[PDB]
Design a binder for this molecule. Structure first.
Ligand SMILES: NS(=O)(=O)c1cccc2c1c([N+](=O)[O-])cc1[nH]c(=O)c(=O)[nH]c12
Ligand SMILES: NS(=O)(=O)c1cccc2c1c([N+](=O)[O-])cc1[nH]c(=O)c(=O)[nH]c12
Lengths: 118, 197, 96, 138, 141
């Protein structure tokens, strides 16, 4: 049987959230969000079964300047813990050297937030 | 004035309140007219795409036999489905054979034609002489322009890292400013005119 | 009476507009005021220390001036200083 | 990444922003994003936050819907799907992402989880209105 | 052997390009980009043009790629630096970089002008509802 591929994610609404009555459902069925359906479609097109989880550190990848060790989903990827990451990973030079990204599924930018004029 | 004024308290009450009303209303009319004549404000009829679908006075079409039409055709969003219905049931042909044809069609008309195109060329043209066009609303699709390479070339990883480094430091933004806004003819007060007949 | 009301109100309002606008007018008093606006063109001698100073400038405002400079005036620049003075005098405030 | 982007910026406008930035607000900066949102909500329009556009839209569509996104995007970046170096899930994943983007799937999911689940809504004349002169009629 | 296309403001011929010989007559965005790319990679390049479509595509019958894509597939060039759109069909036969410029579809309109004043523009300072309330308040008074 083709091995289940381990997917790393992170809690950040709406990308990944816990479905109402989490204890009721187990496994992937308890997770609801944009990234979950994206992973569903991607695995459907590739044709592999996946099991979700969450980065315990709860932080996006970053290296310790002195320890030279990655802290986050990048770590769970480059250290063999995880087989793919489906989350809002910003594309950067530091990560692109030690990780193989994909063409952006969501373009993005810095923007201005103000009080809604009553 | 008046050839007659009321003598009873009730008629005088009516007249007084009418007088107050008249005073306020005439003052307001004059003041708001002064505002209008002092500050020119030109409102674009459109600030989005749904506004464009609801409107029927304004016509809009893409370039015929292109990727934009292919996008609108295979769409699943409601607004773009409505736009596709319109463009498929439009007389005459909203579509066009060349970009310059669409630009000329927009310019010759007066607020009747709206052209759907790429953000970059639109931003460029909004800075060309004649500066008689502008871009409105957000973007209806996401795309990117990418450096290409043959399969197996040793230049893939270096160019990827080069574009990423340039983006992070800010070179590409500077070049865009240089070739779109700077090196751009029109950048980004007129005495008041006497009223005409 | 209606006609009179409209006409007198329009006269008063447009006169207020005239005077208000004539009161907004802030003339040029600095390099920035000249830099942002473009209704007036400004150019220096073709060859000289001023062209070099603007070209080789690391300041924001003069950088913007240089970006504007060398534009299609057709020729903001000039060859003789007397030429620049005459050009400014002939221009009805359209050259600095 | 926003503080670094402004600090390391070679653009005029963002250079001016950075010159203003680090001033005596006392603290324009913030530690938590929720902190910034709360600070903007409390301020009576006296604070403006700089953040990723996606979160700005999501918040704009969240109850009480008392904030808005304004202007274009200062920078331009992207979110991607990561696989470890030398993996068999590189080409297929990229192809799948691109196919989804052309098919319109990603835009539909965006609309669904940003607007079709927003607490708030979906989306002029300087002429004097009757509300301005109501007291006269009363 | 880089490649490019005259679509402005990406590639254009500098004023008095007869004087310029090669790789210096061209100007634009893509050319400066290729300069910086070569600088960060080291290699030397000679800007060229292709024509024959001006961009990539495929003929379903001939099954032969045309343009920049066609020449990259067949070795006629090293890389293509130009506003070349990322797409599924092309990524299957070549390799792209991360986008150096993201964009999307947008709406172009003619700039709103000072509208020719309309007959009965003297009522504009007040809303129609105010005028009707004025009429009926006159009646009632
Ligand atoms: N990899 S990342 O690049 O780590 C990163 C990835 C994904 C979302 C991020 C984010 C960062 N950031 O920069 O720290 C800040 C941030 N701030 C918000 O307010 C928000 O909603 N999302 C984010
Ligand atoms: N790869 S591409 O996709 O070939 C393509 C690449 C680059 C610019 C394009 C363009 C296409 N097109 O669709 O044909 C149409 C088009 N139309 C405009 O008006 C404009 O300014 N730029 C373009």
């Amino acid at each position: 049987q083709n091995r289940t591929y381990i997917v790393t994610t992170i809690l950040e609404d709406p990308y990944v959230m816990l479905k109402k009555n989490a204890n009721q459902f187990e496994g992937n069925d308890r997770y609801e969000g944009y990234c979950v359906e994206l992973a569903a479609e991607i695995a459907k097109h590739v044709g592999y079964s996946y099991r979700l989880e969450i980065v315990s550190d709860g932080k996006y990848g970053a290296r310790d300047p002195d320890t030279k060790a990655w802290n986050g989903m990048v770590g769970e990827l480059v250290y063999g813990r995880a087989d793919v990451a489906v989350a809002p990973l910003t594309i950067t030079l530091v990560r692109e050297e030690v990780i193989d990204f994909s063409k952006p599924f969501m373009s993005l930018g810095i923007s201005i937030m103000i009080k809604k004029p009553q | 004035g008046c050839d007659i004024s009321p003598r009873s308290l009730s008629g005088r009450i009516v007249g007084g309140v009418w007088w107050f009303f008249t005073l306020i209303i005439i003052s307001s009319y004059t003041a708001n007219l002064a505002a209008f004549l002092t500050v020119e404000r030109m409102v674009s009829p459109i600030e989005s795409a749904e506004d464009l679908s609801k409107q029927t006075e304004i016509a809009y079409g893409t370039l015929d036999s292109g990727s934009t039409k292919e996008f609108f055709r295979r769409s699943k969003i409601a607004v773009f489905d409505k736009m596709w219905t319109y463009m498929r049931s439009a007389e005459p042909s909203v579509f066009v054979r060349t970009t310059a044809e669409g630009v000329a069609r927009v310019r010759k008309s007066k607020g009747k034609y709206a052209y759907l195109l790429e953000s970059t060329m639109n931003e460029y043209i909004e800075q060309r002489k004649p500066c008689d066009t502008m871009k409105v609303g957000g973007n209806l699709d996401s795309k990117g322009y990418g450096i290409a390479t043959p399969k197996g070339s040793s230049l893939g990883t270096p160019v990827n890292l080069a574009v990423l480094k340039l983006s992070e430091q800010g070179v590409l933004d500077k070049l865009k400013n240089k070739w779109w806004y700077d090196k751009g003819e029109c950048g980004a007060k007129e005495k008041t005119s006497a009223l005409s007949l | 009476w209606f006609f009179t009301l409209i006409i007198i109100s329009s006269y008063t309002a447009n006169l207020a507009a005239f005077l208000t606008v004539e009161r907004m007018v802030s003339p040029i008093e600095s390099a920035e005021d000249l830099a942002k606006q473009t209704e007036i063109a400004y150019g220096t001698l073709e060859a000289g220390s001023t062209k070099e100073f603007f070209r080789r400038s690391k300041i924001a405002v003069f950088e913007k001036m240089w970006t504007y400079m060398k534009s299609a005036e057709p020729s903001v620049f000039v060859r003789t200083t007397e030429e620049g003075m005459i050009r400014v005098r002939k221009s009805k405030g359209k050259y600095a | 990444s926003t503080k670094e982007f402004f600090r390391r910026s070679k653009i005029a406008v963002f250079e001016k922003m950075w010159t203003y930035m680090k001033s005596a607000e006392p603290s324009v900066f913030v530690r938590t994003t929720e902190e910034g949102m709360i600070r903007v909500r409390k301020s009576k329009g006296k604070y403006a936050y700089l953040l990723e556009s996606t979160m700005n839209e999501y918040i704009e569509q969240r109850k009480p819907c008392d904030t808005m996104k304004v202007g274009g995007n200062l920078d331009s970046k992207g979110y991607g799907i990561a696989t470890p170096k030398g993996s068999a899930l590189r080409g297929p994943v990229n192809l799948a992402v691109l196919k989804l983007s052309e098919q319109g799937v990603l835009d539909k999911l965006k609309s669904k989880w940003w607007y079709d689940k927003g607490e708030c809504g979906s989306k002029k004349t300087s002429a004097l209105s009757l509300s301005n002169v109501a007291g006269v009629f009363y | 052997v880089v490649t490019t296309i005259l679509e402005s403001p990406y590639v254009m011929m500098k004023k008095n390009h007869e004087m310029l010989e090669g790789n210096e007559r061209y100007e634009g965005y893509c050319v400066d980009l290729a300069a910086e790319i070569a600088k960060h990679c080291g290699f030397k390049y000679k800007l060229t043009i292709v024509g024959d479509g001006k961009y990539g595509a495929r003929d379903a019958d001939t099954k032969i790629w045309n343009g920049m894509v066609g020449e990259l597939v067949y070795g006629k060039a090293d890389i293509a630096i130009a506003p070349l759109t990322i797409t599924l069909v092309r990524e299957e036969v070549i390799d792209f970089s991360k986008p150096f410029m993201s964009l999307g579809i947008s709406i172009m309109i003619k700039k709103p002008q000072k509208s020719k004043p309309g007959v009965f523009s003297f009522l504009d300072p007040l809303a129609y509802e105010i005028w009707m309330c004025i009429v009926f308040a006159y009646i009632g008074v």
